[PDB]
Amino acid sequence: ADLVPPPGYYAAVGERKAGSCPAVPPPYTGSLVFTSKYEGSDSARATLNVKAEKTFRSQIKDITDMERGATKLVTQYMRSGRDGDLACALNWMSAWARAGALQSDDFNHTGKSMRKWALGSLSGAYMRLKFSSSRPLAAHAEQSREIEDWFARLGTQVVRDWSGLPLKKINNHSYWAAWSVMSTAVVTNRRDLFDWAVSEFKVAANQVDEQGFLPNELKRRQRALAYHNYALPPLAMIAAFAQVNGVDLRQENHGALQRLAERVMKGVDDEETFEEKTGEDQDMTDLKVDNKYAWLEPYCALYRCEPKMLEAKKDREPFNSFRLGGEVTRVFS
Ligand SMILES: O=C(O)[C@H]1O[C@@H](O)[C@@H](O)[C@@H](O)[C@@H]1O
């Protein structure tokens, strides 16, 4: 059977009551060898290097602008239905597609991370255009084909980028990569990509220990809780997408996805168990950011959320997360 997204992705284009179309960021065709924002850290890779981060953000500026700008345009279109926003979004994505952006075989860890992040953002947003009951892509077949072929090329490459690794090298980056590949799989109806994403979820589920911790995220010391929370959105999205395609992953490794989510939310309330496990007081900075809990939307579509969990979701809605394609609450409501 053809691959499908969760039913919320079939929502009609809205008509809520007008921005213009900015120039497309220059397609990034360069090598993907970038500076790490943690350059100079020890094995925990948790010491921010402000100078390196500045260099990193500068190196990836056109990619960042593309990610944020294109998802914003799709969000605007799905909200208000102005054809100009659709036209602009498709112009941006098809320009990058035709150029073959982000396809470099020259990359380091940071660079391949950028490839999968951008793929997830753009395909995640495009998903709404593709499956909307309004069929907005009907009048844009040539551009649609160009964009989808590009996603397929990138998706195949992302599988290459994160395959062949042992568990100690499989962390939140692989989970995010698997989301990008799942998203691409459904846009492109590619079962092989779907299957890879499912396999990666299963690896993650089996990495969740008996208490709900992930060893490789615990290694990030004072950022441990933050990185556990960072693992949740791609894993929950993969499971929600897999479920409607006939693959139920909710019980993998004794309901590992639930065990991880509950451990995280326990730690958000009381930092104790994470400090005890890491031996360092946790940086709570990221845990204060509402949109970093966007995983609650697919999570509560999968599981019967207890009142604490439901309350956590309601108090932070609506969720916007460009790495998940934009309006997460809308596509699960
Ligand atoms: O420092 C690393 O290992 C990675 O850390 C992650 O948080 C990301 O910042 C990624 O871009 C880096 O390459």
Numbering used by the authors: 28 to 44, 47 to 362
The authors write:
The alg operon also encodes a periplasmic lyase, AlgL. Characterization of this enzyme in vitro demonstrated that it preferentially degrades nonacetylated polymannuronate (polyM) via a ß-elimination mechanism. The structure reveals that AlgL adopts an (α/α)5 toroid fold with five pairs of antiparallel α-helices. Our in vivo studies demonstrate that AlgL does not associate with other alginate biosynthetic proteins and functions as a periplasmic homeostasis enzyme to clear the periplasm of accumulated alginate to prevent cell lysis.
To enable our functional in vivo studies of AlgL and delineate the role of this enzyme in alginate biosynthesis, we first determined its structure, minus its signal sequence (NHis6-AlgL28–362), to 1.65 Å resolution using selenomethionine (SeMet) incorporation and the single-wavelength anomalous dispersion (SAD) technique. AlgL crystallized in space group P212121 with one molecule in the asymmetric unit. Although we cocrystallized the protein with a mannuronate trisaccharide (ManA3), we were only able to detect electron density for a sugar monomer suggesting perhaps that cleavage of the ManA3 substrate may have occurred in crystallo or that the remaining sugar units/moieties were disordered in the structure. While this ManA identifies the location of the active site, we anticipate that it will contain multiple sugar-binding sites given that AlgL’s activity increases linearly with the number of residues in the substrate. Indeed, examination of the enzyme’s surface electrostatic properties and residue conservation revealed an elongated, highly conserved, and strongly electropositive groove. In addition to the pronounced, long substrate-binding groove, we also identified an extended loop that partially closes over the ManA-binding site, known as the lid-loop. Similar to Y246F A1-III, the sugar monomer modeled in our AlgL structure occupies subsite +1. However, this monomer adopts a different orientation; a variation that is most likely attributable to the lack of additional conformational restraints that a longer sugar polymer would provide. The conformation of the lid-loop correlates with the presence of a ligand in the +1 subsite, with the lid-loop in the Y246F A1-III and AlgL structures in a more enclosed conformation, while the loop adopts a more open conformation in the WT A1-III structure. In our AlgL structure, we found that the Nζ atom of lid-loop residue K66 interacts via a hydrogen bond with the hydroxyl group of the C-2 of ManA.
